[PDB]
Amino acid sequence: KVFREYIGALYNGVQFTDVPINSGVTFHFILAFAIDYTSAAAATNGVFNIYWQNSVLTPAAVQAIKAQHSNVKVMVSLGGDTISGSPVQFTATSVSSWVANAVSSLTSLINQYHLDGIDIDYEHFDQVSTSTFVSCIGQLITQLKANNVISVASIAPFDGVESQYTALFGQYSSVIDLVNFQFYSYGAGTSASQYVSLYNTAASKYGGGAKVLASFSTGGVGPAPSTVLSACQQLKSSGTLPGIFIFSADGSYASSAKFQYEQQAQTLLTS
Ligand SMILES: [Mg+2]
Numbered sequence: 174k175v176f177r178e179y180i181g182a183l184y185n186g187v188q189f190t191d192v193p194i195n196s197g198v199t200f201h202f203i204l205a206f207a208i209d210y211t212s213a214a215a216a217t218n219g220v221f222n223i224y225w226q227n228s229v230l231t232p233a234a235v236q237a238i239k240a241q242h243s244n245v246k247v248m249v250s251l252g253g254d255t256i257s258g259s260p261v262q263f264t265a266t267s268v269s270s271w272v273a274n275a276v277s278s279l280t281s282l283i284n285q286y287h288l289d290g291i292d293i294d295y296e297h298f299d300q301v302s303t304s305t306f307v308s309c310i311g312q313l314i315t316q317l318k319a320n321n322v323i324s325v326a327s328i329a330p331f332d333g334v335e336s337q338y339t340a341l342f343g344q345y346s347s348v349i350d351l352v353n354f355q356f357y358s359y360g361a362g363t364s365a366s367q368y369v370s371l372y373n374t375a376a377s378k379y380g381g382g383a384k385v386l387a388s389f390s391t392g393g394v395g396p397a398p399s400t401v402l403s404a405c406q407q408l409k410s411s412g413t414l415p416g417i418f419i420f421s422a423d424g425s426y427a428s429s430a431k432f433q434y435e436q437q438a439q440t441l442l443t444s
Pocket residue numbers: 254
């Protein structure tokens with residue numbers, strides 16, 4: 174019964190408090206994004222900087238939402254698509270130096286913002302080998318778990334990055350709790366039946382489904398949310414739906430539909 178909500182990357186004023194929270198789900202906010210780049214789009218070799226709207230989504234805001242709702246945790250997502258318009262290319266000076274900077278800088282950030290975990294959301298690999306990427310991230314997650322710094326690690330794959338993320342998951346599944354597979358990568362014409370099929374295929378690549386969350390976008394891309402919710406009811410009826418995530422609170426905030434699908438998703442998971 175996991176529900177997750179990405180939030181903070183658009184700097185559009187959305188707050189944790191705008192998002193419907195059902196007391197009956199395991200609720201995760203995911204701050205988007207921490208990036209190991211400078212604002213001039215220079216890589217920092219794993220020293221993570223803040224690229225969510227942290228003047229609004231402050232440490233006090235994280236502490237407050239968690240104090241009010243005992244079922245809420247807050248994680249941070251790494252990478253994303255762009256940094257000041259440039260692609261966030263995963264890049265490391267060396268594996269060991271990137272890992273040392275990533276573990277330390279994210280530990281500092283997690284302690285500062287009262288966070289519970291990290292989500293891996295790199296998508297550009299034109300400047301790094303897959304082995305290098307997998308080693309960096311696998312070590313990062315393994316160390317944060319061993320150091321008792323995080324309770325939840327996730328990855329956010331889609332088909333275009335299958336080579337990287339299946340290698341990562343197949344190797345580090347014991348320390349990766351959740352697979353935030355991006356089903357909003359598929360077409361807007363996707364039917365509920367097709368979605369169930371697409372979910373089965375993705376689940377087959379990421380351990381069978383126990384850890385693989387369904388998802389949709391509220392930003393006007395991918396399968397229609399109402400259609401995805403229908404597919405999710407079928408997966409739930411089968412006893413094979415671990416949870417749902419939405420990209421994103423910012424999208425919902427700016428949308429005409431507002432947050433009705435966040436609510437519907439959580440109601441589905443708890444009913
Ligand atoms: Mg994207």
